[PDB]
Amino acid sequence: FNILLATDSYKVTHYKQYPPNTSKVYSYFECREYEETVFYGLQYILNKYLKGKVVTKEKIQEAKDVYKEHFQDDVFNEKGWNYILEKYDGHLPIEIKAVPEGFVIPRGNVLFTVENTDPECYWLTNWIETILVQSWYPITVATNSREQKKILAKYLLETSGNLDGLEYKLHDFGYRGVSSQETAGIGASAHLVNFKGTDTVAGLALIKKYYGTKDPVPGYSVPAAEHSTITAWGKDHEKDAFEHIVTQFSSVPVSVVSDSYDIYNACEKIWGEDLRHLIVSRSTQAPLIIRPDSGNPLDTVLKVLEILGKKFPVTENSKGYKLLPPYLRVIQGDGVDINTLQEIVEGMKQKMWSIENIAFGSGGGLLQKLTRDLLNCSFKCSYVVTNGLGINVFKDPVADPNKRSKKGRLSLHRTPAGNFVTLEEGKGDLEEYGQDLLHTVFKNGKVTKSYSFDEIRKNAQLN
Amino acid sequence: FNILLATDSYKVTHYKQYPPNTSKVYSYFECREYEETVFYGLQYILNKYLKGKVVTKEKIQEAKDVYKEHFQDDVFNEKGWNYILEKYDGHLPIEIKAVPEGFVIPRGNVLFTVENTDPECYWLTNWIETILVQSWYPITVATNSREQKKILAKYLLETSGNLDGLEYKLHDFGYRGVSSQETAGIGASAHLVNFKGTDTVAGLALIKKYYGTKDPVPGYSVPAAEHSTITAWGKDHEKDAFEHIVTQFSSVPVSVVSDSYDIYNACEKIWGEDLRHLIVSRSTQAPLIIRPDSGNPLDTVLKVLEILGKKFPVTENSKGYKLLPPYLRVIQGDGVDINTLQEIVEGMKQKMWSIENIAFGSGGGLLQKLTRDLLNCSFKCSYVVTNGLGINVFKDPVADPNKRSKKGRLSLHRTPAGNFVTLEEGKGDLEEYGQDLLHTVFKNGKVTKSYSFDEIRKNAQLN
Numbered sequence: 001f002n003i004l005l006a007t008d009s010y011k012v013t014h015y016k017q018y019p020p021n022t023s024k025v026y027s028y029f030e031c032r033e034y035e036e037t038v039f040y041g042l043q044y045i046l047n048k049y050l051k052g053k054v055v056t057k058e059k060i061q062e063a064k065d066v067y068k069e070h071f072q073d074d075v076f077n078e079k080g081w082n083y084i085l086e087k088y089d090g091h092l093p094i095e096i097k098a099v100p101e102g103f104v105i106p107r108g109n110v111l112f113t114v115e116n117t118d119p120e121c122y123w124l125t126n127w128i129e130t131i132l133v134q135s136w137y138p139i140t141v142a143t144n145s146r147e148q149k150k151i152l153a154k155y156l157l158e159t160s161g162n163l164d165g166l167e168y169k170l171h172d173f174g175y176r177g178v179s180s181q182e183t184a185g186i187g188a189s190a191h192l193v194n195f196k197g198t199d200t201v202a203g204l205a206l207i208k209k210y211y212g213t214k215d216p217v218p219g220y221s222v223p224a225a226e227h228s229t230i231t232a233w234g235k236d237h238e239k240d241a242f243e244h245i246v247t248q249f250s251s252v253p254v255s256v257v258s259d260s261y262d263i264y265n266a267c268e269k270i271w272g273e274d275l276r277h278l279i280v281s282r283s284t285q286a287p288l289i290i291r292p293d294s295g296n297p298l299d300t301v302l303k304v305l306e307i308l309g310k311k312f313p314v315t316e317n318s319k320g321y322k323l324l325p326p327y328l329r330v331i332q333g334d335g336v337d338i339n340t341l342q343e344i345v346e347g348m349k350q351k352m353w354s355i356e357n358i359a360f361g362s363g364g365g366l367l368q369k370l371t372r373d374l375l376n377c378s379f380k381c382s383y384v385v386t387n388g389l390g391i392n393v394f395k396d397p398v399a400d401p402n403k404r405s406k407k408g409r410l411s412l413h414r415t416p417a418g419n420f421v422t423l424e425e426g427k428g429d430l431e432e433y434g435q436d437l438l439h440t441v442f443k444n445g446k447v448t449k450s451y452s453f454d455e456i457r458k459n460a461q462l463n
Numbered sequence: 464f465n466i467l468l469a470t471d472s473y474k475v476t477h478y479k480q481y482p483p484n485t486s487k488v489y490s491y492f493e494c495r496e497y498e499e500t501v502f503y504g505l506q507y508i509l510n511k512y513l514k515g516k517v518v519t520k521e522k523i524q525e526a527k528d529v530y531k532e533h534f535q536d537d538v539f540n541e542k543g544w545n546y547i548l549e550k551y552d553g554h555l556p557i558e559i560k561a562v563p564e565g566f567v568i569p570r571g572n573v574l575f576t577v578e579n580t581d582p583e584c585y586w587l588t589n590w591i592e593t594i595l596v597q598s599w600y601p602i603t604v605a606t607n608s609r610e611q612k613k614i615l616a617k618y619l620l621e622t623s624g625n626l627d628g629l630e631y632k633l634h635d636f637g638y639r640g641v642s643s644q645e646t647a648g649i650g651a652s653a654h655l656v657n658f659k660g661t662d663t664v665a666g667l668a669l670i671k672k673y674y675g676t677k678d679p680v681p682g683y684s685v686p687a688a689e690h691s692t693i694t695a696w697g698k699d700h701e702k703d704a705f706e707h708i709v710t711q712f713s714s715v716p717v718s719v720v721s722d723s724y725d726i727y728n729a730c731e732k733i734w735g736e737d738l739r740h741l742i743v744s745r746s747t748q749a750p751l752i753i754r755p756d757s758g759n760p761l762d763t764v765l766k767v768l769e770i771l772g773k774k775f776p777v778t779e780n781s782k783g784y785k786l787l788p789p790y791l792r793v794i795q796g797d798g799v800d801i802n803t804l805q806e807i808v809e810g811m812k813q814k815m816w817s818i819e820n821i822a823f824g825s826g827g828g829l830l831q832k833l834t835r836d837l838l839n840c841s842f843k844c845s846y847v848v849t850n851g852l853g854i855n856v857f858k859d860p861v862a863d864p865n866k867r868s869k870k871g872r873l874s875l876h877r878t879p880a881g882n883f884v885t886l887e888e889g890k891g892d893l894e895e896y897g898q899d900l901l902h903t904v905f906k907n908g909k910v911t912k913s914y915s916f917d918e919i920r921k922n923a924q925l926n
């Protein structure tokens with residue numbers, strides 16, 4: 001990895017565009033204007049890409065050679081990068097302040113700030129904007145995942161009277177559905193801030209190395225079938241496949257995809273009749289989890305439950321909602337996103353089915369179908385010092401008032417009512433709103449403050 | 464990187480689910496049912512993750528330790544992995560056949576197949592589905608980018624009479640809008656299959672290391688401003704910032720963001736009057752490229768062109784369309800996706816503006832706002848050998864006919880009319896449709912056939 005080649009191309013030419021005699025460039029990151037966001041992911045970036053000796057004589061030469069052809073011109077700041085190598089032994093003379101990870105903050109507030117600690121490196125601040133802005137991703141995955149948990153908690157509480165098993169109702173099925181291996185790990189780790197279920201193995205290793213947990217692992221899975229393990233037996237032998245699988249995993253929970261040919265026939269005749277004896281004998285610690293995987297998500301779930309309710313003994317919990325026996329559950333993992341999840345639990349409640357009967361799996365909807373525009377994640381310069389005089393800078397496009405950026409030195413505070421407020425123009429300097437909530441997390445090539453994955457989860461809890 | 468920890472969790476348990484006495488598992492990839500797709504990206508995966516010695520005693524132990532806790536049970540196939548380590552020195556006993564990279568194939572055709580070469584490793588075929596399926600991303604980026612080139616080619620030819628500069632009309636602005644550094648490199652390289660302009664530097668190194676070009680680099684850029692380099696001068700000094708920037712880059716093309724405060728005032732008064740003398744003097748090889756970055760994309764472009772056409776000498780080309788002077792152009796790089804791009808060129812044409820005047824920049828829309836569902840990318844088992852007998856495998860969900868998979872051994876052929884057809888059930892064996900277009904690209908831990916980035920671009924050319 002070469003940090004000199006890890007920025008938007010045009011940033012290579014910025015050192016020749018700022019006003020002469022500029023000694024400081026101060027910038028901040030915010031989610032402009034999903035009313036609250038979970039701040040998570042910065043720590044990973046600081047350790048993997050920004051800390052330690054990130055500049056070498058060879059990295060400078062390589063960058064120079066690429067840029068010469070890329071621009072068909074010599075515009076690369078070789079002297080500037082050589083200064084960092086010689087003066088700081090390749091360590092970045094930058095200071096980053098940020099809100100603690102796992103913190104849930106309302107939109108339009110400063111989440112972190114970046115600035116240079118050496119006047120010679122005034123151009124460095126925005127050089128690293130590209131790398132830091134990518135924090136939008138783990139922030140968005142964690143936020144959207146937490147919003148789904150809110151919906152699940154509401155309906156589970158209404159239909160059951162408690163939140164037992166909540167942290168297991170949204171399972172990560174997105175490994176193959178993301179853009180890369182690195183994204184898989186970052187995204188899966190962000191989802192684990194809210195839940196404990198994942199099949200995206202890559203997330204475990206990331207958490208262990210960059211955050212850490214008291215427990216051996218932060219996420220869990222159970223044995224389960226895929227279409228290949230069912231269909232390989234032959235069209236006419238779906239029953240033999242089911243029987244063999246549940247027998248191989250008879251003492252632990254097992255998820256079995258049942259829509260290979262006819263989900264309704266499988267539920268009613270196969271599980272419901274032919275193999276019913278191997279199901280009602282299962283332990284409460286090892287239920288069979290039926291998994292449909294096609295058709296209209298809501299219609300399929302409701303019909304599946306109606307069928308099962310007629311083949312198995314259902315009870316009525318204390319809230320008046322129907323409950324399948326303890327050795328039988330369902331997981332809907334097709335076409336699930338924040339919107340369809342809401343429709344399903346609502347539809348279930350209307351038909352008097354408890355949310356305890358179901359769990360949801362989500363792939364593309366959880367880890368891939370998200371953009372930097374969802375939460376309006378933005379990085380902008382708000383303050384500079386030129387000729388020894390600091391000025392508050394900002395943008396304010398006429399055609400879009402929402403793109404208006406904040407001015408001057410920023411700080412985050414608690415309001416008298418216990419809410420959040422971002423003070424601009426160095427006003428935090430006045431002690432009218434108490435202490436600044438941001439903490440220095442990076443300074444001159446070193447990580448100065450960190451959080452365990454356990455603290456992050458605590459910070460991200462629901463009210 | 465540990466391949467044993469690079470799969471969907473449940474696949475760790477599949478070796479106990481296949482029918483007993485199974486010696487072969489054969490699977491394929493396709494974009495079910497954007498009528499044609501560009502096949503690209505597999506080579507990167509084969510070299511980075513699948514080739515050479517991918518198994519060690521340490522990797523086996525590491526995987527075992529993680530899985531024991533992840534599943535809270537011992538279900539890991541230690542024996543299976545140890546067999547590969549001792550017998551093939553950690554090399555994968557697998558064979559992958561694929562259509563040449565860059566090839567343009569219609570939907571619903573086999574793109575690549577996977578199978579085990581050793582009977583003991585029948586479970587390996589689908590273990591690596593997760594890694595291989597991620598090819599959906601570079602395939603999708605390349606396909607979506609090519610479809611945008613088609614729109615541009617159509618309108619440019621209509622308004623200008625030719626396609627000069629077409630390969631520079633869609634620029635990659637997505638570096639910060641993607642989910643990770645790795646994705647950035649993959650996505651940027653996929654766009655470069657169709658165009659020559661990028662600011663996502665990461666793509667260059669990926670191409671050079673895994674594919675290669677005759678030229679030094681495959682992508683180019685020009686110096687340009689960002690809001691920070693304009694706003695840092697102070698609200699009242701936007702003109703000073705502009706003057707300084709175009710003067711620092713007086714002999715090469717230069718892109719200048721002009722919507723900091725008022726894009727329309729900037730075009731008409733600043734560029735149009737105050738600094739008009741530094742513009743009209745510019746060389747045809749170094750034009751000023753004005754860049755709006757806010758407001759309704761179509762309304763903004765049209766209004767900017769109307770303003771410029773009144774402050775600078777416009778000519779009427781041989782097609783009757785309006786053309787700005789050679790030292791002046793425009794780039795719309797906000798809110799650009801496949802849909803808005805089409806609305807812009809159509810709006811420009813109705814107003815009699817030539818497409819020569821403009822280029823487009825795209826970030827999230829080009830590299831992030833895409834899913835595995837866009838082209839219905841799917842990997843499925845179509846053939847197995849059990850008890851020495853081969854059988855055709857497939858799924859056919861009752862609620863979704865579109866989810867039906869192909870059966871048996873597959874092969875891709877040219878039709879008599881020069882189109883494409885995928886033969887099922889080993890019917891390719893009969894020599895009725897000529898030669899199979901799929902080639903062995905990987906076998907037993909070695910890449911057997913590779914393509915240069917130059918061949919790939921050639922294969923992906925527009926008709």
Ligand SMILES: CCNc1nc(-c2ccc(NC(=O)NCc3ccc(N)nc3)c(F)c2)ccc1C(=O)NCCN1CCCCC1
Binds near residue numbers: 197
């Ligand atoms: C409603 C089900 N409940 C739960 N389901 C799961 C659960 C269900 C399914 C899968 N996997 C799966 O479907 N794999 C397919 C797949 C995999 C990858 C991919 N890419 N695509 C598809 C899984 F990993 C976990 C876990 C916990 C609970 C839960 O409630 N635990 C708390 C219960 N607790 C206290 C009471 C006594 C028992 C212990």
Ligand SMILES: CCNc1nc(-c2ccc(NC(=O)NCc3ccc(N)nc3)c(F)c2)ccc1C(=O)NCCN1CCCCC1
Binds near residue numbers: 634637793796
């Ligand atoms: C209509 C414009 N035409 C062209 N524009 C560009 C072009 C325009 C703008 C930018 N960069 C930019 O806006 N950067 C901002 C930015 C950066 C990152 C980020 N994340 N966000 C925003 C760029 F890199 C390239 C290139 C070639 C042509 C073209 O036509 N060349 C071939 C014709 N040419 C041949 C040689 C003789 C003269 C005629």
